[PDB]
Design a protein around this ligand. Structure first.
Ligand SMILES: NC(=O)c1ccc[n+]([C@@H]2O[C@H](COP(=O)([O-])OP(=O)(O)OC[C@H]3O[C@@H](n4cnc5c(N)ncnc54)[C@H](OP(=O)(O)O)[C@@H]3O)[C@@H](O)[C@H]2O)c1
Ligand SMILES: NC(=O)c1ccc[n+]([C@@H]2O[C@H](COP(=O)([O-])OP(=O)(O)OC[C@H]3O[C@@H](n4cnc5c(N)ncnc54)[C@H](OP(=O)(O)O)[C@@H]3O)[C@@H](O)[C@H]2O)c1
Ligand SMILES: C[C@]12CC[C@@H]3c4ccc(O)cc4CC[C@H]3[C@@H]1CC[C@@H]2O
Ligand SMILES: C[C@]12CC[C@@H]3c4ccc(O)cc4CC[C@H]3[C@@H]1CC[C@@H]2O
Lengths: 285, 285
């Protein structure tokens, strides 16, 4: 009867806010399974659930490690209703710093969670939706998935990957009645460092002095972009709802038009020369 | 004196042809290190080298596994000249089939070689080029790195990833005098299956009958696109040379204009609705 929704990465940010937005919806039409990698981080979720007074049984927490298919299979199994009407692939890791300063482990982790982890969720949940000829999948994208940002080389690699992943799939799913949609967010309030980097001593030991200088410049710039452009996760969460209510969802939703013009010069110069120059002066003056 | 060039994935295709194109250049200005994952596959390379009469000492073969940084460090070490003037990140794996039918291992492998393997090469070789304030990096892209293709979900994920990887880096490298360039190839002659898939019994056991039907349709279509549009690796290899001779290289080179219009409707409809529909009818009629 209710729309069963399964969301990944609900310890914070978009995922946590989206879970509570849905479970507490005045209409009581959503049954929400908020998954989290470690159950010890579930308190912020329950505290938000109490604030928005989610009624008993509208929200459940599941431990789900997207880097593990047995974990993915186990949470799938936990879906009491026997079907998921809306799957939200939200789990994600950030990674910021000079390429040469990133640990191999850190690099592999990011793609394993952002990319292979989404592939796992889709392998486990699409089969059933295709069968029923129904279901919606929302994947949280990023402006960094649409244009390259310096010092976010690997993060962007993973976000650009999701675009390719979802776009290829969408061309196939079109006739199965299964809708997949990317929600492209610009910066969103509630974070730290920006994503994840190392101490300046760590980064200095791992890079040249000039790249180290550039990094600082990028960080100062990003901090200002967040200050003047960051959105409340409440406003971003509502975009996920606009997408899931669309009788005919598009492949892509943007939570803001703020980056569209920059996305435009990128789109209008296939060679990438205009964007690289524009983004260079935009960050490094 | 000579331009030291190190190329990855030279057992076949673009990499093999590019190595011999350079080593045999009438000007004898390139010193080429052609790397290969397994040295047992080096015969096609030496046979091509003899056909184009590469002079003694213009070409050397190195075993390099991009999935292993110790292997990456060892080949770096083997560069007798102590510098690489041109790095060509060419090594790549394809992967074709319904998402649900791909092995987790196969999925992780593809991103490990196409994405993390390129990250490894760049971590190992960029530092020195940045220091000298010179060097060129050419990365072999794909039309699948610019637009999603059905049944190539993971392959596209990895090719789209490289775009994000190289684009972020380019915005940073601009002032270090280091040039990075993606060479976007459409289909190129000398392949098998298209990239890599499983036997129809394997794929049927792993997917629904309708998706199985769609796959066949995609395969028939791709085979026709190859037949009518595939380029000789000789013509594709020359584009790498156009890029490396450009006094001011752009971020992106296209080996053909054949897919630009389709790339256009993709660029002109940010929501992705036009491209998904256009590509759907293009493949599945
Ligand atoms: N933060 C921003 O400024 C911003 C901007 C644009 C787009 N976004 C996007 O939104 C997503 C999440 O960002 P957010 O902080 O706003 O929300 P979020 O819901 O906190 O997503 C990040 C989450 O990933 C989860 N995660 C980490 N490792 C995991 C693993 N192995 N398995 C499963 N889940 C794992 C974490 O909690 P769990 O314990 O639940 O797993 C965490 O909640 C990303 O995909 C990102 O592109 C965020
Ligand atoms: N084939 C096409 O139709 C086509 C079309 C468009 C773009 N391209 C692009 O060109 C690249 C190569 O395709 P190609 O067949 O034309 O040329 P290629 O030079 O044969 O590249 C594929 C190569 O990857 C190498 N490789 C596989 N695993 C590796 C590993 N672990 N470590 C290092 N190298 C590994 C293989 O030989 P080694 O033993 O040398 O390593 C193989 O030669 C890809 O990145 C692809 O995007 C090809
Ligand atoms: C990549 C993000 C969107 C694009 C943002 C951006 C966009 C443009 C720009 O000039 C700088 C930055 C810095 C912070 C970036 C954000 C950090 C988190 C978010 O996902
Ligand atoms: C992805 C590739 C470029 C784009 C090609 C394409 C492009 C358009 C299209 O309608 C179908 C195909 C099938 C084969 C694809 C190719 C297979 C190898 C190559 O890299």
């Amino acid at each position: 009867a209710r729309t069963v929704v399964l969301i990944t990465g609900c310890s914070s940010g978009i995922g946590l806010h989206l879970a509570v937005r849905l479970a507490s919806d005045p209409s009581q039409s959503f049954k929400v399974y908020a998954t989290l990698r470690d159950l010890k981080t579930q308190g912020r979720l329950w505290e938000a659930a109490r604030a928005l007074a989610c009624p008993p049984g509208s929200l459940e927490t599941l431990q789900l490690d997207v880097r593990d298919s047995k974990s993915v299979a186990a949470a799938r199994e936990r879906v009491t209703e026997g079907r998921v009407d809306v799957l939200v692939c939200n789990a994600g890791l950030g990674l910021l710093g000079p390429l040469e300063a990133l640990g191999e482990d850190a690099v592999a982790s990011v793609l394993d969670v952002n990319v292979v982890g989404t592939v796992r969720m889709l392998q486990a949940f699409l089969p059933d939706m295709k069968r029923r000829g129904s279901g919606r999948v929302l994947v949280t994208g990023s402006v960094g998935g649409l244009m390259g940002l310096p010092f976010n080389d690997v993060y962007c690699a993973s976000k650009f990957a999701l675009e390719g992943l979802c776009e290829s799939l969408a061309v196939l799913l079109l006739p199965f009645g299964v809708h997949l949609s990317l929600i492209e967010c610009g910066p969103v309030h509630t974070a730290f460092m920006e994503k994840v980097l190392g101490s300046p001593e760590e980064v200095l030991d791992r890079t040249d002095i000039h790249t180290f200088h550039r990094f600082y410049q990028y960080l100062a710039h990003s901090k200002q972009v967040f200050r003047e452009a960051a959105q409340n996760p409440e406003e971003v969460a509502e975009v996920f709802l606009t997408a899931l209510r669309a009788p005919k969802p598009t492949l892509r939703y943007f939570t803001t038009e703020r980056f569209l013009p920059l996305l435009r010069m990128r789109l209008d110069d296939p060679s990438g020369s205009n964007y690289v120059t524009a983004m260079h002066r935009e960050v490094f003056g």
